[PDB]
């Protein structure tokens, strides 16, 4: 994973996202959704999804939320106050903690001013607590600004490392982008049964055709402009959509 003071930032893009494999995986110790409850994720579409990744203590997962304070949310990683995405977190004691102490996971513990939301700060200047200038050397009131979790496998819970992923769905002003996947059902030909063919919504009896589209045409229309044939996306065969029976 990535440190907590320099988190990563992956920009998921145009794709088919299935948040159900996430939501039901039962391997996550924390799955909170803020802008939008979790089950309705596989039914919406946005412009961009960002995914941020890092590693923190066990009991600092409560500062990854809109409107908190503490050493992590103050100056390591700040979430805006109208967040939209979801926060996922799971314990990772066996991967990240090693006997003798894993001193490769640092965090920032001194900064001049709290972060703006989604702002990032990887500098390593000597912090200056008191009024006396520091001149790049340590000493009283002149502190190195980074400390390291020394993770060890015999740590009580709440001191073992947790890995965190923060998904943030954003909607700029584009034309569209990633959305969930659409299911499908078997096709029953010959029976006024409601239907949906990748967007075409209708009603009627479906029947095997004997017309021949051109190999880029989806559905056929009549004079007076009513849909009367379709092509099945999966098997690519033409079926006449005769209106239902009435009189």
């Amino acid at each position, epitope marked *: 994973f990535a440190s907590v003071y320099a988190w990563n930032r992956k920009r998921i893009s145009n794709c088919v996202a299935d948040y159900s494999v996430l939501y039901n995986s039962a391997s996550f110790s924390t799955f909170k959704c803020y802008g939008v409850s979790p089950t309705k994720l596989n039914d919406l579409c946005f412009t961009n999804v960002y995914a941020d990744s890092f590693v923190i203590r066990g009991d600092e997962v409560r500062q990854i939320a809109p409107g908190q304070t503490g050493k992590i949310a103050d100056y390591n990683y700040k979430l805006p106050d109208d967040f939209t995405g979801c926060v996922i977190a799971w314990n990772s004691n066996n991967l990240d903690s090693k006997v003798g*102490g894993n*001193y*490769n996971y640092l965090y920032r*513990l*001194f900064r001049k001013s709290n972060l703006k939301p989604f702002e990032r700060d990887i500098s390593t200047e000597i912090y200056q*607590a008191g009024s006396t200038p520091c001149n790049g050397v*340590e*000493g*009283f009131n002149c*502190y*190195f600004p*980074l*400390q*390291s979790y*020394g993770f060890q496998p015999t740590n009580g819970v709440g*001191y073992q490392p947790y890995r965190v992923v923060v998904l943030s769905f954003e909607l700029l002003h584009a034309p569209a982008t990633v959305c969930g996947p659409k299911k499908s059902t078997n096709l029953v030909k010959n029976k006024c049964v409601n239907f949906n063919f990748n967007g075409l919504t209708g009603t009627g009896v479906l029947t095997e055709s004997n017309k021949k589209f051109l190999p880029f045409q989806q559905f056929g229309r009549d004079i007076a402009d009513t849909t009367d044939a379709v092509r099945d996306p999966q098997t690519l065969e033409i079926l006449d959509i005769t209106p239902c029976s009435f009189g």
Partner: antibody
Amino acid sequence: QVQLQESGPGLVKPSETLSLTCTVSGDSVSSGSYYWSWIRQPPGKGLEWIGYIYYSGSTNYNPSLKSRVTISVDTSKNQFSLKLSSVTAADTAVYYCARERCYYGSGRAPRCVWFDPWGQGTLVTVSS
Amino acid sequence: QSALTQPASVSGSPGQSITISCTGTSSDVGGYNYVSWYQQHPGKAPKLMIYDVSNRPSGVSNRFSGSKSGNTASLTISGLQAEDEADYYCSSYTSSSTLVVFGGGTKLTVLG
């Protein structure tokens, strides 16, 4: 400025578990930036080091006094305290509490030096 | 390991100069830049006046100064007074396990 004071004395017997408690005034414990420690000194002899706690809960101890001493933090009354168990007759010493500066390491524990303000020191004896 | 404070006792005449050495083991105590000195009056808590290896904190006498050479550390004074009779200890940050080591103590006397 800052001040330190120890408490919890008493003619402790042999094979007990004594507890000293150092309280701080003028600086919060959970602020980072300083590591609170413990130093004993037997009478007529030199100093030796015992342990430290950081505000997170990270501990360290002397390996000669290892598996015998636990030190813990209270952030509610701004104090920290040790407990040393199975006391022999050699621990009749003066016990100071002080804070350390503890410069930043490099992926391998943090090094500390110089210290700062030493407690007041409360002689603690062990006899019958 | 223990950075033997060179000599145990020490004699001095009031006014001129005293230098106290502090040798130890290898670059885990000497070849680092972290040594400190402490003055303990008889019946009181000790008090630092020298840190890092040669830095005076906020308000001490200017007679106090130290230096480093190889595996030995030095502390010197530049003019003695009657109130400077105490013990003196060295510190040091090793890498072994005892984290921080301590001196054995030198007794400064004001003969005269």
